[PDB]
Structures are given as C-alpha cells and as structure tokens.
Design a protein around this ligand. Structure first.
Ligand SMILES: *C(=O)[C@@H]1CCC(=O)N1
Length: 41
C-alpha cells in the first residue's frame, strides 16, 4: 500500500492505512517522496 500523508505536501505521514486518505492530504509510494510522487488526495 502507498504511504499516506495528512498534509498536502506529504509532510505528515500517518502510516500506511487501507483508507489511506482520511482527509484530503496526500500519499506516495515512497515515504517522503519527490514532488512528482507527492500525490495529493
Ligand atoms: C502496497 O502497495 C504494498 C502491497 C502490500 C504491502 O504491504 N505494500
């Protein structure tokens, strides 16, 4: 599963959860990713 972040710019990682985006944050396939991997929710 992708790494999930609560904040838009993948600053706050909240673990990798099945729901992933509880809020409209971001997620990525790399914990603290490059700009292009910082996929917003
Ligand atoms: C998530 O994309 C992958 C698939 C299983 C796991 O633990 N990570």
């Amino acid at each position: 599963e992708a790494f999930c972040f609560s904040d838009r710019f993948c600053q706050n990682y909240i673990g990798s959860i099945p729901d992933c985006c509880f809020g409209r944050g971001s997620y990525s396939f790399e914990l603290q990713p490059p700009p292009w991997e910082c996929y917003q929710c």
